[PDB]
Design an enzyme around this catalytic site. Structure first.
Site, mmCIF file in Angstrom:
data_model
loop_
_atom_site.group_PDB
_atom_site.id
_atom_site.type_symbol
_atom_site.label_atom_id
_atom_site.label_comp_id
_atom_site.label_asym_id
_atom_site.label_seq_id
_atom_site.Cartn_x
_atom_site.Cartn_y
_atom_site.Cartn_z
ATOM 1 N N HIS B 36 0.879 -1.194 0.000
ATOM 2 C CA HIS B 36 0.000 0.000 0.000
ATOM 3 C C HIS B 36 0.901 1.223 0.000
ATOM 4 C CE1 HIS B 36 0.168 0.070 4.465
ATOM 5 N NE2 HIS B 36 0.149 1.385 4.206
ATOM 6 N N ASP B 63 -0.083 -7.450 1.208
ATOM 7 C CA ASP B 63 0.331 -6.038 1.389
ATOM 8 C C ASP B 63 1.850 -6.089 1.262
ATOM 9 O OD1 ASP B 63 -0.556 -3.271 3.807
ATOM 10 O OD2 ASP B 63 0.495 -3.353 1.891
ATOM 11 N N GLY B 141 2.325 6.003 9.272
ATOM 12 C CA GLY B 141 3.718 6.313 8.848
ATOM 13 C C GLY B 141 4.693 5.168 9.123
ATOM 14 N N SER B 143 3.981 2.018 8.508
ATOM 15 C CA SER B 143 3.726 1.011 7.469
ATOM 16 C C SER B 143 4.985 0.684 6.679
ATOM 17 C CB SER B 143 2.729 1.431 6.383
ATOM 18 O OG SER B 143 1.497 1.786 6.963
ATOM 19 N N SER B 159 1.769 -3.478 8.183
ATOM 20 C CA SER B 159 0.647 -3.275 7.248
ATOM 21 C C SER B 159 -0.350 -2.281 7.846
ATOM 22 C CB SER B 159 -0.172 -4.537 6.938
ATOM 23 O OG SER B 159 -1.270 -4.225 6.024
#
Lengths: 4, 198
Positions: B36, B63, B141, B143, B159
């Site tokens: 993502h 992801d 942030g 991720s 994720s």
């Protein structure tokens, strides 16, 4: 949940 | 730029995400991150300089992503922990109940335990299946950032989770946190990547  | 797990990178001069782990693919350098975070060919920048572009990604469903870097980047077998570092030694998958930590540009280095495997997250974009759940807190942030054991075994890349109005789940008790990561194993085999270790 949410992305991140 | 020195590629270390946990540090910030931007995508197409807009979003921010965190580096997962330094990896190689034959002679090409890269880092694994969250799908993502960008679409194929988006440009990744580290401290304002271009470092590479997204080579592949899967989101939603899974992801995951890998960014291939130019030759000038220095890949390191480390994850940021404040001013210190955690050496990556491998990718043995820990079991439910193991302690784990995660590193990212928003909340820094946080630890907790793995509470469940094979969880589904229903994001606005579609479902993301097979995530592992831990209770270390995470913020918007974080991720793509590293999930690793104190012993150096790389577990996955961040994720999502149940972030509150403050942008994180750090203000709610560990028992109520759901912070999800994508397993590293399948990303390494899907893209034919090798982890940089030390």
């Amino acid at each position: 949940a949410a992305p991140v | 730029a020195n590629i270390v797990g946990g540090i910030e990178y931007s995508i197409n001069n807009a979003s921010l995400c965190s580096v997962g782990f330094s990896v190689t693919r034959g002679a090409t350098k890269g880092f694994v991150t969250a799908g993502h975070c960008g679409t194929v060919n988006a440009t990744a920048r580290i401290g304002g300089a271009v470092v590479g572009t997204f080579a592949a990604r899967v989101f939603p469903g899974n992801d995951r992503a890998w960014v291939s870097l130019t030759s000038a980047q220095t890949l390191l077998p480390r994850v940021a922990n404040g001013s210190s570092f955690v050496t990556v030694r491998g990718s043995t998958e820990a079991a439910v109940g193991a302690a784990v930590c995660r590193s990212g540009r928003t909340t820094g280095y946080q630890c907790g335990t793995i509470t469940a495997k094979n969880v589904t997250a229903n994001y606005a974009e579609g479902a993301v299946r097979g995530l592992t759940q831990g209770n270390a807190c995470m913020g918007r942030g974080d991720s793509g950032g590293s999930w690793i054991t104190s012993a150096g075994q790389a577990q996955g890349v961040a994720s999502g989770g149940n972030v509150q109005s403050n942008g994180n789940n750090c203000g709610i008790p560990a028992s109520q946190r759901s912070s999800l990561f994508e397993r590293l194993q399948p990303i390494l085999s899907q893209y034919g990547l090798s982890l940089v270790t030390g």
